[PDB]
Design a protein around this nucleic acid. Sequence first.
RNA 1: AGCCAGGAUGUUGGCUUAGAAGCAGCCAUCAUUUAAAGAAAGCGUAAUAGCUCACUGGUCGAGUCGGCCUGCGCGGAAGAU
Lengths: 141, 176, 556, 38
Amino acid sequence: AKKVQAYVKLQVAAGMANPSPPVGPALGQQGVNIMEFCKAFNAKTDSIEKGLPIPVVITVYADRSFTFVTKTPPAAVLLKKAAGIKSGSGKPNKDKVGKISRAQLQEIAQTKAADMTGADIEAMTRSIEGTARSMGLVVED
Amino acid sequence: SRVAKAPVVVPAGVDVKINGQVITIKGKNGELTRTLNDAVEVKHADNTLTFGPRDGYADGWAQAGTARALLNSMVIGVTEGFTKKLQLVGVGYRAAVKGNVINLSLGFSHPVDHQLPAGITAECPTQTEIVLKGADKQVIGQVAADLRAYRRPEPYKGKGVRYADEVVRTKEAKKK
Amino acid sequence: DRMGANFLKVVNQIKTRLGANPVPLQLAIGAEEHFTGVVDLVKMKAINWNDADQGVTFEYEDIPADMVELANEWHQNLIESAAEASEELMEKYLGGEELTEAEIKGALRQRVLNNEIILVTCGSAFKNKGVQAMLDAVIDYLPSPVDVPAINGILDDGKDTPAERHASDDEPFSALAFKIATDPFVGNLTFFRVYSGVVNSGDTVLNSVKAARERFGRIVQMHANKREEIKEVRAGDIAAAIGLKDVTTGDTLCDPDAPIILERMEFPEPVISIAVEPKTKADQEKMGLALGRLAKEDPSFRVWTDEESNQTIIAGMGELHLDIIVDRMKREFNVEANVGKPQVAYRETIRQKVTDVEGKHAKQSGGRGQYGHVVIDMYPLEPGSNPKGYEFINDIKGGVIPGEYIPAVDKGIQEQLKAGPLAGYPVVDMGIRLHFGSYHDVDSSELAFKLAASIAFKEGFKKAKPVLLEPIMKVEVETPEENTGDVIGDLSRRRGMLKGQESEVTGVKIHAEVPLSEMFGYATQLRSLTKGRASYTMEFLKYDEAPSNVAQAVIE
Amino acid sequence: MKVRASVKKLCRNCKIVKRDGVIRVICSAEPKHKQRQG
RNA sequence: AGCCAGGAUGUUGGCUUAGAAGCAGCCAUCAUUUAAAGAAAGCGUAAUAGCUCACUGGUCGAGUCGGCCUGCGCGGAAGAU
């Protein structure tokens, strides 16, 4: 949409109301009331069981305005939400633990298909196979 | 070259006096003349000025490459002018214009009031901002840089006299 | 009378930073060097001052012609300041009844009992320009002890009945105890102020908050320096309630069968703690008792004395005070101090582990050459739960050293376990295993294996890099602006184990875990980071280490 | 201006121009990276 | 080589998550769009907001660029009636 003024996509798990210090600056860019971004998203945050980093983007406007785009959580954390542990990448090509087939990957891609125009089904399938091999995970169908 | 692909277009309102090597430009508010070197072949051809490097001085592509940039600035300097603003950041430091003289509240035991030459119409909107106006690009810097050299930008506070567009690099104490 | 001294800037800077409502009165005439007039705006009169004299003239004139319009636009904001002070001046700002000098102050004096506006005045103290002007506002804008709510003694514990007592001489006596200085003449002194009532000379003045009996001696007034004996203390004087046996911060000075106060609010915490050490051993006899008359003066001066090392560990809120109380000891208390470091638990641990160190013993002490070439193996510092700091795992090869000579080798190791090859830092809590104990008959005794074990233990430390088991304090720091990023980076120079950055309405409170061994000049360093703008807490939580690597070369 | 026999182009934005014949190297923000001999 | 010029945007890139959130460092080192973009070079820095390299995506509208070999030149080069 917009241009060289501001465009950063950063939001982490929305159970924490206070802007986490490293996220702070993406809210510390164009003069927000930080209570506004706390009161914008919580009307829909009560339709979730919190625990995963959900992303939003920030985008700005002239006087004191701003805007933001809501999407669904990415499949990268959805790989390690089902797998139990949040960080598995210790050795990529030397660990063979943990299987999920393609059927789980497409049903977490329909929620991408019902939300976004990129991150398409069949193209991300090798990169949701590619985030498996870097973590040291296996896949069979 | 790039300079050979750069001719300058004199407009109406600035008259040239081509006595060969000595050109005295009769302009809007002054007389911006430069007595160039003999490594140039000058001709106000139709309206757009064309130049040339003389033989023997084949390094005159440099010596007239100065000149192509030179006279372009002269015809636009005698008419429009240069705004050369300076930013006075000093504890108790003021600036005020009277006639052609500038005060210098410069933290000394005695005042410094230096008279400024022709080609200068100076102004001061406040104690920290000071206009300089002029016709030559050299004289609009030379009288400006002398003030700045009396109190250089101090890189521990940001103290000093500094230009409008100049951005200092102030450091931190880090010991005590 | 200085450059950059804009009067109208600073009073209109309070409305931006302090957020208050100042409406100033005495304005400025002069370009700060030829400055001659201070513009009082109620009476609209400028005041002439001394040519250079220390105080001749007070010559009042009109408003000068060089400021005839700035007096116009600023007087109309003065006479605003009573229409919104009292509701009754609202209809004569607009109706146009005259706003005289005497009428407006009757509203504004009642605007000092709620304190929404402060009254500002420009001038010079040192150039004698304004000091004679500044006194007339004090009797008309600063409140009197009989115009204020007076002494309000509540009760004790029965019921909350706050009772406004009288400001005149017709009440039971009442005072308070503060600024309780000392002297080598009578001992304790006070700078106390009586609010109402009259006392005679000689009284059984108690301190009714701490249940003690005192008698009222010879009271003395000062010119802030010189002894002038004030016999009869009237209601409102400030004097020296002398001869109090025990007295604390802010308790009552009151006759019995009278109202009684019990109030001590905001007891401070002196934060920076430095440990004073004597010069001679005759000094500690007089520096052990230094706490007596010194800490009795003020609660911004504490001594956190240890339980073991018996050194005197002081505590101040500023080192700038911990300057002065050493200089208070210097020429009058006649003390030579050696100010050093506080008692941090310095329990030498071990980074490296020595393989085998043999104590070389060979001496014909008892007739035949009493030998004793015993060898010990440096075992890792015993961790977890180990109440005994001495964990000698005597591993005699086949029970070769007899029970009689077991104390021998034990003593040697124990002696160097309590000692330290750096600055006598106990290598305690360090489990030590005996490798092999050489045993003899006529060459076996106590020294035989004691002396050997002593050297053996020390030898090992030289090739074992003993570090420093250290206590870790929970250190919080409160800093308002975005200048804490330089702090927490400089805190990262000192192993401040970070917890999180949190905010308040005005402050950004940082949470960290800092080694107590890394305290040193923490106070003076943040005071050059925070510029002194910091107000925070100090607690304790974990226990970690601090780099030493001294065995390499520093340790002989 | 520090002097040494070696002018090595050290800072990432280091200008080199031959003023008077002796080389002195021009950085932008680092005064420490400016040598003059060689 | 400069002025406009997006720095297309999956991601938090883990670990150990206290921040080691492309910018501390070890193993991977795929890329949803490939007419412009790497799981990355420094500065801003606890982290990032700010500013770029990346392709110059659109303008100028011609030459230009980094090294190898030699002819010579400069610096290196300061001494004592």
